[PDB]
Amino acid sequence: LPAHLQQTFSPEEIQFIVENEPIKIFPRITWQLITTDDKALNNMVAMRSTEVVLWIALLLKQQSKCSIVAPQWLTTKELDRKIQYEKTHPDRFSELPWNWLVLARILFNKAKDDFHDPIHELRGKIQDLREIRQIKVLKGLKYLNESHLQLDNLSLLEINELRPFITEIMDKLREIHTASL
Amino acid sequence: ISQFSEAYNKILRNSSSHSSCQLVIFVSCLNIDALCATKMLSLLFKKQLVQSQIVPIFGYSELRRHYSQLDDNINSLLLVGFGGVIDLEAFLEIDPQEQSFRRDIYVLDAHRPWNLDNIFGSQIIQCFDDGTVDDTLGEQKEAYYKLLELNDLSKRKQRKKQIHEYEGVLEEYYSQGTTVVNSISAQIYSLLSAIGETNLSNLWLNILGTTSLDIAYAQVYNRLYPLLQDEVKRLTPSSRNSVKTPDTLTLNIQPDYYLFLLRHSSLYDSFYYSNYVNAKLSLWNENGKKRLHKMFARMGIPLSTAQETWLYMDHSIKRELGIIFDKNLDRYGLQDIIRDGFVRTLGYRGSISASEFVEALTALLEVGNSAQKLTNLRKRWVSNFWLSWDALDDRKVELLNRGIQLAQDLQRAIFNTGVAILEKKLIKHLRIYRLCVLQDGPDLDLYRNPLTLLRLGNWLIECCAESEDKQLLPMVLASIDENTDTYLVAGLTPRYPRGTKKPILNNFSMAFQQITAETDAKVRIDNFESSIIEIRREDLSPFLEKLTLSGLL
Amino acid sequence: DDDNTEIIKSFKNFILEFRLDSQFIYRDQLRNNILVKNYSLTVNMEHLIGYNEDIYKKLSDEPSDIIPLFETAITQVAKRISILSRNSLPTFQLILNSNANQIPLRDLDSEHVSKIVRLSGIIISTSVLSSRATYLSIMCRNCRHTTSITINNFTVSLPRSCNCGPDPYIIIHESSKFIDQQFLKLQEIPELVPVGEMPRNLTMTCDRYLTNKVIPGTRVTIVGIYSIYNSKVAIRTPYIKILGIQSDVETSSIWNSVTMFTEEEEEEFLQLSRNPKLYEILTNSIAPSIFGNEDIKKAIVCLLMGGSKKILPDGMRLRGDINVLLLGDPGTAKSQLLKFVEKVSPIAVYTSGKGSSAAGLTASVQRDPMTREFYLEGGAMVLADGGVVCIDEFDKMRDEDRVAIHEAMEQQTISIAKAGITTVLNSRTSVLAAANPIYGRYDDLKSPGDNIDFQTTILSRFDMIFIVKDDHNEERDISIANHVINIHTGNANAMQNQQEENGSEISIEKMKRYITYCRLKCAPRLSPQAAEKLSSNFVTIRKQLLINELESTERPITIRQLEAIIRITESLAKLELSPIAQERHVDEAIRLFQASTMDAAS
Amino acid sequence: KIYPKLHQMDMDKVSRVYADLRRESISTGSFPITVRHLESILRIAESFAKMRLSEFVSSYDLDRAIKVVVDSFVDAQKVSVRRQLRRSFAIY
DNA sequence: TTTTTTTTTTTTTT
Ligand SMILES: Nc1ncnc2c1ncn2[C@@H]1O[C@H](COP(=O)(O)OP(=O)(O)NP(=O)(O)O)[C@@H](O)[C@H]1O
């Protein structure tokens, strides 16, 4: 009996979800490993771009025998185009990698060394991004009605963290409304 | 006697397996030299992904307790700060266990002289002295190879005379003043350097490790600045700001002071609880009090501004502070305060000199928490040891600040107490040595800590003797609260006024042994450190008569 | 001002950039508080000195000329945080506190004027809310030019430029925005630095979210700024404008109130209830000083929790919690005891009067000699409402409102019909009577009654009445006499209580938070049979004191005495944090007043 | 300036000897002792300590105080104090 | 450009 949470996923868990996504790395090394869901690989070329799953890269980065590439979406000049799109579109949430907030904390915890100037930059840009996005959320919350919801582009962290409030509430809405008849 | 790369790459061979391992550190003990060294070492093991148990031993006998207690399939071993004098092969015994023996043991320390069993007869060790003391030390070379394997009547007293020559030679070694030499941290730093790794952390841990002892001599620590400052020049965090940045944010050299708790405490009390100010300027005296206020009368500084928090003193008073000092402090003999040493920066959380960051580490040692009561107690000390382990970790800066204020608590006890003993005039000059004793007062449990009396009598030897001409004399202090009269007692040695002609080699390590070789009733070597023992009041007074004669030094 | 605008940019920088690893604390704090409608932020000056020293060096220099600027940016910060554009958004408040360095009040003169001073003192009396301008606009009496003034802080008369003259402008009152201002009258701490003299009171002023933050008569800390204004040479009145204010520990309390929650309390308060010694360990909280007198020692506790207070319709309501008598020979420790008791109370007033120190024991309404018109001046009993009543010298209390004590203890009120005002105002205050009995031990061979003034009725008015008799007796002394020299130096008994802290005993600044805690939960109540037990116990208490009075002895008992012992039950029960009360539970409350029944028998 | 302090080591003696100073304070009349009366003795000694500027109380510093308290009480007793002398002797 | 104010409450006292 899980007790907690229970319907919603723990952020602690959802991170375990996203940790299963593919990304590119820059190996130090030149058995098999066999594993299960891995496929690849034969001894993987050092100092070259290669696709793997995140968590393995996390661990070998912990041995520093690999280096994780910054996602091509994650950059200062890019965040600018997206957040600007965000200000000029008061209703739509624009477009995101969707595992991103988790990715942010994940990489900054360890992968911090691989980026060029994420420090004192992106954490602010994404704090603000999450900000204007958060007010776009909260302001979208007055249209809340049964039964229709367009959250469109919203991140799983973003969503799940607030899941209980719309879910639980909306039931109290729909139930009573159709109950009228 | 081996370069680090060999023993390290060899401990690798015995290193990874599951379940682990089998090898473990013995943190030894409460002395700080291990703490940084262990931590970097910890990180090392954590960097090579290797499971290790972590043991914070306290008692000397407690080592026997632990080695005999649980070690089973352990294929290799680490130890610190111990066995630089007494051999474990005798202490543990051991005995052969399966050439290429089933178990390796590592041991680290700067204390001298090494045991005769330490460089030669390699069984448990794997002697770590490299590359500090070669020396030679060609005396142990003859302590075995002349000793081993050792007309027939006249060559009998001849062989025994040459052996008596080796006996009288080797007798002088192993009978000699015990001293510290080099912070093991820099050994493991040049070790990590041999492997090629240098982390700004690890150099700062080196700083704290080296700096750990700076109240005690240097002596190589004087030349350690180059062994460190150059590495500080080996680290170029950036060409330029890059303000601040909120992260890295790394150390630099600056005007440090022997004056105490500068950054986080009032400038007044900074001069006031500080050791160097104490004896030189006579702090227990009201004379030197007013006289100190003369210093601000030359510093253009308000008594209020002395009561001020360091954070709020005017930027003017900050920039001109050192120059002011240069225009004044040279008057009373205070020119040796100023030091160019190292300061870590968390920036937004503040900046802290190494020298400062040391003290709060030493705070968590005594505070911040029938013979079984004191074992439970020592156990509490070892318990609060760990809070200092995490107090090394930057991740929580908050818990550190506890011990930081606690330093003001400690010193507020100490400073007050020392003076309390000064106007009492508890000093007995004796002949060979100055000595005192503490029967009672406030917070004697706080005086149970070896270090509280260490800091205490450190402060009090600096105090009692600047010099304070002439002929600096070694010291001993004692105290009791509970346990029926354990009377914690420690040996102590004079610090020169920054101008050290000789190493000076404490003789009480041997002498207390001569009393433990003497009637030795109630005497307890349960302590790791020869400088200090438990003693019963009943036999301590005759322990004092037996301490008078024979005077060894 | 573009210099000030560079400073504006400097603070916007200060907020957006700053990090404690990794969230930007003030930045979070903003969007946190904007939905609180706090519209204010509390900033550590140390995160500031940690961010850039420069801006403080100039901030510490003429903060008055900057503090509003500091706000004009952060009020803009919300603009870039609260919402996106392309309302109405109120001009922010800022409250800054810092560890700083404490300064004593008596030494405050000139010098530091127009700077920051951290300091404590204590507030005496709260001024009424006084609202002040925020925005105002004006049409001209003659040219009808429409002016707009943003009135900012921190006088300044209205500008006259578009006969037109001299200054033809009157406020547009309809469209204007506003804020409250408190006008704190606060006093230096009782301890320092009176020297020989009287405590000073220096006047300061709250505004906006700072207002009503602090109770009259509670220990507090204000930072603020030392400044002056004329207020009819040049002889201008000294004062301090207020930013930011922080309560001295806690004080929080008011109103309804606070926890908040820091969960470990519930558990730690429940474990207390699971500790069988808790009642008695509270008893061991009360006097580190006093060894012995365990009876009255158990008697103090049950008052502070509050007892049964039940309001049942109609307007009939019975008091809590009760009254207690410390009357006995000097050497009772009862004044030393009381000086524990008041420090225990979350909110109370210590009265040795007469009334304390200068207080009319009851509120005495006194005309403002300026602009006439009587206004109620407050009273010790009044200010102590929902808190402890401390009384010494009760032999000497004011006789006229002695009756207002004879009343307020019971009806939980004081009626003032005097002058204009008829309002019956609340004193729910619970009295503890510490007075010294007439002639000491001499009323013992006499009639013990009429000891208190000329009537026995005061006893009825009180509840737990206790006569403390110390004979010079052996060995009960030699152990407390042994306790003595330990108590003094070196606090050899005050160390011995710190291992009982780790072993058992309460910290007692905790005890405040405990009694604050369980007085805010609803009133405890007994099951029926302990009550019927109060009936067969008391039918014999009353029977016993008619039969005791078979000697025609004058006296003592009432039907408010039984009920008095009732409230002690819900007291001792409110210890338990239990809606019910067990039979024996009540029973030691019985044995607890039982000594007072023999006080009737002696 | 000077702030005197006794040590508990020799000062239990005044708990036992106060027991001596009160057990027979029963013997004749009452009181005019209190537990405050006991409290005050240390207050008497500390003063002499302040005169000696010893900064903490010597044993003799008590002997002053104690000896004061003795006859402070003793001739304050009535002619029955003829007996009350012979008891407080050991408190000399 | 300035205007205009003695009872009631409490107190300490022979
Ligand atoms: N546990 C204790 N019992 C008795 N006396 C104590 C105790 N602890 C300390 N004392 C001392 O004895 C005095 C106790 O107060 P006490 O003599 O009863 O005066 P009081 O009655 O409290 N004041 P008052 O209300 O005017 O009679 C204090 O002055 C202390 O010095």
Side-chain angles (χ1 to χ4, degrees), chain D:
Chain D
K1 302 175 64 93
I2 195 73
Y3 296 149
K5 301 184 179 310
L6 64 77
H7 284 281
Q8 288 304 296
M9 287 181 290
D10 27 13
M11 280 29 164
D12 289 343
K13 190 184 79 69
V14 182
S15 359
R16 164 191 49 217
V17 165
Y18 171 82
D20 308 336
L21 261 36
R22 203 208 179 81
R23 59 178 281 269
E24 290 191 5
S25 72
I26 309 179
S27 267
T28 50
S30 26
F31 292 93
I33 330 110
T34 328
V35 271
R36 248 164 92 104
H37 207 146
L38 194 183
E39 182 279 323
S40 62
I41 316 314
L42 294 66
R43 179 170 73 243
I44 306 178
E46 69 191 15
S47 52
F48 302 113
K50 288 196 185 183
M51 314 195 82
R52 206 169 164 190
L53 286 78
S54 69
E55 202 275 335
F56 57 100
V57 185
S58 172
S59 175
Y60 295 96
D61 311 348
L62 307 186
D63 303 336
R64 281 269 179 270
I66 313 166
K67 276 328 284 173
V68 165
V69 196
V70 177
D71 36 18
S72 179
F73 172 66
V74 193
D75 293 328
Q77 296 310 93
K78 97 168 127 182
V79 190
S80 188
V81 77
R82 165 156 233 152
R83 187 162 301 99
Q84 165 58 64
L85 287 166
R86 274 168 290 187
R87 47 157 319 289
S88 26
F89 283 170
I91 327 295
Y92 183 93

Side-chain angles (χ1 to χ4, degrees), chain C residues 268-269 272-273 275-288 294 296-302 304-305 340 344 504-508 510-512 514-515 518 571-577:
Chain C
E268 87 197 346
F269 296 163
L272 292 194
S273 81
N275 279 331
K277 277 72 182 167
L278 180 75
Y279 160 84
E280 240 188 34
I281 205 175
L282 283 10
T283 76
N284 302 131
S285 98
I286 284 188
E294 76 294 358
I296 235 156
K297 180 90 141 280
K298 295 192 306 176
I300 310 137
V301 164
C302 42
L304 245 192
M305 312 286 299
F340 186 88
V344 198
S504 57
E505 195 41 51
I506 313 122
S507 27
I508 303 142
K510 217 100 159 300
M511 185 68 53
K512 179 187 271 197
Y514 174 95
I515 299 173
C518 203
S571 75
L572 194 158
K574 212 172 198 336
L575 296 176
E576 235 188 345
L577 221 152

Side-chain angles (χ1 to χ4, degrees), chain B residues 530-553:
Chain B
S530 61
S531 70
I532 165 174
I533 61 180
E534 291 177 340
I535 190 68
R536 290 291 327 262
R537 69 184 306 268
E538 312 168 339
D539 292 338
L540 87 70
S541 181
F543 169 102
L544 293 186
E545 297 176 351
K546 300 164 184 177
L547 194 58
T548 55
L549 55 88
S550 77
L552 282 82
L553 59 83

